[PDB]
Write a protein that binds this ligand. Structure first.
Ligand code: SF4
Ligand code: SF4
Ligand code: FES
Ligand code: FES
Ligand SMILES: [Fe+3]
Ligand SMILES: [Fe+3]
Lengths: 634, 634
């Protein structure tokens, strides 16, 4: 039964096709891996030196300790810290790329890029303390780019993409515990050092370092969103579609996959100039579709329809209609390069540090972006021509998606109810119980969990209990593909209080109907937008984030990046659910820190719960405990 | 039989004591780990996301590929790259600490530190291009410290502690392959990114990134040596002793253990001012002894005797006479904190990012170094008092050690034969066959190998074949403890040609006898001194390093740092032996790159050989192939 693999009907249909065609999928590779190693599952394995591999039995007799003397506590904490550092390295590497792109753009070195959002640029400069009065925009932008790059290393200030984005009282709590990062790449390196053999060997000390590195990840996320908004525009509400039915047999279908809008944004613009060239080849046009975060980026800004996400990404190929898959980095199953031989798809890498054996590599340079995009799209057009006459099987399955809810857009929507105190109508409805609290869904799909099952099960229970639900990344992807971003489903999905608020906001925005059930706040770096919203609420209320009825759920987490995000959610003060097991259960002391005693440090805490109906109850309890702490009914 | 555990008789004696006293050692923890996991041993395990753990059978049936599609090639290369990045993070973290210390010293913020080697400071400034004429030393030093810190991040120049230390022709080869690092912490982060899930998935591309990150490690090593020489003095020839017999029952015995001379150098100086305070407590004085690299640092500069190294570090404690073990970071078995409860030793950590549960922590600040050192040494004095009346068992085993052969010191010794062309007498004797070639022994001991057995077996064979042998780190430690640094053993150990050269140099230096059989070039960062010597020889000859009859051997390697060092030795052009299995054999394509096709990229290559008599033959063949390529007899 394909329903045990994915709850998405389009994915189920393509799983049937892959099976009859003998094309191995992620689910088949998972089945072939079972049973998985219990040492790795519990975190009780270490390969940090050539005396290893070392392992510790979770229970029973020897081995009980690593060869060097490393305890279970130490081994588990060191492994977790390296995962946080790896996640930080990815989000902040993405941000660094955008900083260099902005710098090039304003220095005259990359004319395909420009300041598109001047309002965003000036507001970021003001937040950072960079003067704007009497300065040319290009000079302000150069200073912002230089400040972004300076946050990667030690200097006379800490990381400003932490200290300028959280309220002073939160920064103070963190500073008292030594948790403010000194530099993003500095912290990543310090983790790698401290976790190497014969260094840090105290679980609490190790985990404090991990919390600090998670804040370096947050800075990378926030910097990425900031810079992408300057370069490509801050999102506003947009209407599009999702799921495999957005592919079109009669078009050149091009997926943008990976992460950085420096690549996907140009593919979108250049594809429109090439419509007549695609038509000369017998297509109707070029149909750009999204996969994973770079898909979210172009969905949020341009309404490009999302094809699929995360674990099911191979299924777009199995249709037979995917002419090209254009990749930068992160979250791309390398299986795509071999599946392409069977499906005909042209898989194209573009970044020097992210190649896949068997894929075609087209170097992308920001200095030649338009030229490089045309070379890529001409490969896609050629591939379309080669499938002239082949039947394709595109499931006729799609949902309507309203998205584009940046924090600026949410504030603007609320301002239609209260022009000069936009956050107040949200707060009023929390106080009166029409909004019980807020839950951010974030993160990936994971082959261990039937695809989307945790996201939808938890979201349904929260929505019925009047929780305002926001989402990013492939959590937003799951919810969009199951109709949670279609305002036509508000009546079915939402409790009466939440429906009343979504309707009041929507009617004030001229929609004649509500906002959607779930607000799509963007890509995974755009988890930083949720931070901006929550920090703005905390500041408006004069309380810290750990007193707000706000929770997060990485319900189906996979990537090291999702571990980093969950960790900074805890660090900034949120109850944070994770719906898969991180490799921590082999140490009860480490588990106790992450799920309990960190409350006394940051006010946040992990909630590890694999059963989604139980997870929803635990998330509601966390929200309601925060309501009670504010003196509110619940 | 303790000879299967260690070839060091003092270690054997303490293993007997530990056994009868029920104190578990590293060897016992290794026995309890057997059989070790074959997936980890071969590199065929991945835990880079929460879909894992993934494994690949080396041979047979499924699993054959990771869940995301990662091949054996990819998994092996990604794991290796993360080990290189971790090694870079340690050596360069050490260097960064020294850069901040020098900066503080010359800004008036840390008066226990100063410019001790003004000649070294000016020569480093000249090498970097920093002007010195008409500048105050403190201003030159501030500029050098600032340049050191700038090499950690991207800027308008590549990493100068690579490009200014290798000859232009070598830099050109590396640059053509994209291998020059852009910034030290930048490269570490880029490795962590590219090796995270769904990123780089091409073995050759991954390994090129690893070679580049290994050059970031080299820069950290060279920067560490440079800055420590400025602050603490460039080594010159010194005579001391090694092995456990350097402990003294009637003294306060204090081991300095870990890595950074910012800590050990001050412990040495302050201990002398506290002699009368130790005597009031009934001791003869404070006897500072070394373990691991920080021991090597104070041995090289001050003649502090070395107690033990690497795998046998617990044995110093088992004597019952070790009153304190003063730690900073790296290579410290965390077992020491629990062994201390049985032996009475006071284990003291000092660095915020390297704590050990159960050890006493005394924060060390460079701004208060002397005060903090006295607090630490008073704990040691108190511990001595508590063992009044307890028998101790110090093996009466020690060797004489001549050390202090910095590259400056080697050039100066050679200059007694040829004042204005000091390298020429060395080259002349290579040409005439009195010196067959040069071999650098480097790296750790590893519990899998009977301690020291590979270092001594290989060195004996090379010395008899007239190879000039230099050593660093715990390879120098092994050789010193077995008499290879005592000039009285030249007749026994050295071939006639090598004896003739060591005698000619020694007699010209007024010794009435030879240089020692092996030249101790210092700590592990001081592998950079061997680079300086080899680069100077290459420059004098007008050839690149990959034409010289110079090889390296990490004969008993353990730490991620040793993997990084071996990798940069290959990258700079050396045949590089490793005497333990790195986790690569699960991929034949990766093994073939590292042992064969990298020759076409850098001219260097790994020689993986666990049998030391065979390794010696392979190293001699590599030397002789280089002689033949220069047209020399062999
Ligand atoms: S660091 Fe310690 S626990 Fe890890 S592999 Fe090495 S000896 Fe084993
Ligand atoms: S990155 Fe790929 S091979 Fe590694 S644990 Fe995740 S699914 Fe498995
Ligand atoms: S023993 Fe299986 S993850 Fe290491
Ligand atoms: S399966 Fe043993 S190292 Fe992972
Ligand atoms: Fe993502
Ligand atoms: Fe060392």
């Amino acid at each position: 039964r394909q329903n045990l693999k994915s709850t998405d009907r389009a994915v189920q249909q393509m799983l049937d096709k892959a099976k009859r065609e003998g094309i191995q999928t992620v689910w088949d590779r998972y089945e072939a891996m079972k049973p998985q190693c219990g040492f790795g599952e519990t975190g009780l394995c270490c390969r940090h030196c050539l005396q290893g591999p070392c392992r510790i039995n979770p229970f029973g007799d020897e081995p009980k300790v690593g060869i060097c003397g490393a305890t279970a506590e130490v081994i588990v904490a060191r492994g977790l810290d390296r995962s946080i550092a790896a996640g930080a390295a990815g989000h902040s590497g993405h941000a660094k790329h955008l900083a260099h792109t902005l710098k090039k753009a304003v220095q005259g070195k990359a004319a395909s890029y420009m300041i598109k959002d001047r309002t965003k640029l000036h507001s970021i400069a003001k937040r950072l303390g960079i003067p704007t009065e009497g300065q040319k925009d290009e000079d302000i932008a150069l200073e912002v780019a230089k400040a972004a790059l300076a946050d990667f290393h030690e200097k006379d200030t800490p990381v400003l993409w932490v200290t300028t984005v959280l309220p002073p009282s939160r920064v103070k709590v963190l500073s008292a515990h030594g948790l403010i990062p000194a530099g993003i790449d500095h912290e990543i390196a310090e983790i790698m050092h401290r976790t190497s053999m014969g260094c840090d060997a105290d679980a609490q000390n190790l985990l404090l370092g991990g919390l600090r590195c998670s804040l370096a990840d947050l800075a990378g996320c926030y910097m990425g969103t900031d810079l992408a908004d300057i370069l490509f525009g801050t999102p506003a509400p947009v209407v599009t579609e999702s799921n495999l039915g957005v592919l079109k047999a009669d078009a050149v279908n091009v997926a943008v996959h990976g992460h950085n809008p420096v690549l996907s944004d140009i593919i979108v613009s250049v594809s429109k100039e090439m419509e007549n060239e695609a038509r000369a080849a017998g297509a109707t046009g070029i149909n750009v579709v999204g996969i994973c975060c770079t898909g979210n980026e172009v969905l949020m800004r341009h309404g490009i329809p999302a094809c699929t996400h995360s674990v099911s990404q191979e299924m777009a190929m199995i249709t037979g209609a995917l002419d090209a898959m254009i990749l930068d980095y992160q979250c791309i199953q390398p299986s795509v390069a071999t599946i392409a031989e069977c499906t005909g798809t042209t898989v194209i890498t573009t970044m020097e540090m992210s190649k896949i054996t068997g894929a075609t590599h087209v170097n992308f340079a920001e200095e030649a972006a338009v030229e490089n995009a045309k070379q890529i799209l001409r490969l896609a057009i050629d591939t379309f021509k080669r499938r002239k006459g082949k039947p394709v099987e595109i499931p006729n399955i799609k949902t309507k998606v309203v998205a584009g809810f940046s924090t600026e857009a949410i504030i603007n929507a609320l301002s239609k109810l209260n022009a000069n105190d936009p956050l107040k109508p949200l707060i009023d409805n929390v106080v009166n119980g029409n909004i019980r609290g807020v839950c951010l869904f974030a993160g990936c799909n994971n082959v261990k969990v039937p695809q989307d099952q945790n996201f939808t099960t938890i979201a349904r229970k929260l929505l019925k209990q009047n929780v305002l639900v926001v989402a990013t990344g492939c959590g937003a992807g799951a919810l969009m593909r199951h109709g949670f971003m279609d305002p036509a489903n508000v009546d079915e999905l939402c409790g009466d209080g939440l429906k009343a608020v979504l309707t009041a906001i929507g009617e004030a925005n001229g929609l004649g109907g509500p906002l959607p059930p779930v607000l799509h706040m963007g890509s995974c770096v755009d988890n930083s937008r949720a931070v901006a919203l929550v920090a703005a609420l905390a500041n408006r209320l004069g309380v810290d984030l750990d007193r707000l009825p706000v929770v997060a759920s990485a319900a189906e987490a996979m990537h090291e990046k999702a571990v980093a995000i969950g960790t900074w959610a805890v660090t900034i003060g949120l109850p944070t659910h994770i719906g898969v097991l991180p490799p921590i259960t082999g140490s009860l002391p480490v588990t106790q820190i992450l799920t309990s005693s960190v409350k006394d440090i940051t006010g946040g805490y992990f909630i590890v719960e694999l059963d989604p109906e139980t997870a929803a109850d635990k998330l509601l309890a966390a929200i309601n405990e925060r309501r009670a702490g504010l003196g509110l009914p619940w």
